[PDB]
């Protein structure tokens, strides 16, 4: 159970925003220009790491 739970959490936090516009990277890249998208991607990377 513990193992499964950990994995589920590790996948569930892929859907978390971590202070960005959306959890989907492609949505952020499509909607925002590269200079503005850099900060959103940076927040997502910090959260996921």
């Amino acid at each position: 159970n513990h193992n499964a739970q950990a994995l589920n959490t590790l996948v569930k936090q892929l859907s978390s925003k971590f202070g960005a516009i959306s959890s989907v990277l492609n949505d952020i890249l499509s909607r925002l220009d590269p200079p503005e998208a850099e900060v959103q991607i940076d927040r997502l990377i910090t959260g996921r790491l």
Binding site: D33, P34, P35, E36, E38
Partner: protein, 49 residues
């Protein structure tokens, strides 16, 4: 990170540009009553530069 006609079709600075942009008015020298048509800018390109 600026979007606009000049930025995308004439001269595009990089996202991580390191440099100084210096601008000063030239109306006293480069303006003619008849119309100085020497200076030109591009307004139709196939893709972004």
């Amino acid at each position: 990170g600026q979007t606009g006609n000049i930025a995308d079709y004439n001269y595009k600075l990089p996202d991580d540009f390191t440099g100084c942009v210096i601008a000063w008015n030239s109306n006293k020298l480069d303006s003619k009553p008849s119309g100085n048509y020497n200076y030109r800018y591009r307004l139709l390109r196939k893709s972004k530069l």
